[PDB]
């Protein structure tokens, strides 16, 4: 979190690594944002079928 660039290098981690991913069984797993319809809002659609 608070490590500076030198501390990151000494710890064998790239300073330029953005992070934002988990490490599960050694695999860098990233969660992709999932789109969904907005909740709590009234929506009137055009079912013609």
């Amino acid at each position: 979190n608070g490590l500076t660039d030198r501390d990151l290098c000494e710890l064998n981690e790239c300073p330029l690594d953005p992070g934002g991913y988990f490490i599960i069984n050694g695999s860098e797993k990233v969660l992709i944002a999932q789109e969904k319809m907005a909740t709590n809002t009234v929506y009137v659609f055009a079912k013609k079928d």
Partner: protein, 64 residues
């Protein structure tokens, strides 16, 4: 990662000019004049030495 020994296009030696180029830049020389003072006339060598990134400097931060 490191400066190429030779210009890819013509084959002029530019591996010995990276440190001199950095020193000239630290001497408040503009990039064009720094390249001219190093004898790089053809724009291929100027491309080679102007567009290079010294990634080995960052690679050397990690302990062996």
């Amino acid at each position: 990662m490191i400066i190429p020994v030779r210009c890819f296009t013509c084959g002029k030696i530019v591996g010995n000019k990276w440190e001199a180029y950095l020193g000239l830049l630290q001497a408040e020389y503009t990039e064009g004049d720094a390249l001219d003072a190093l004898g790089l006339k053809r724009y291929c060598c100027r491309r080679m030495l102007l567009a290079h990134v010294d990634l080995i400097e960052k690679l050397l931060n990690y302990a062996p």
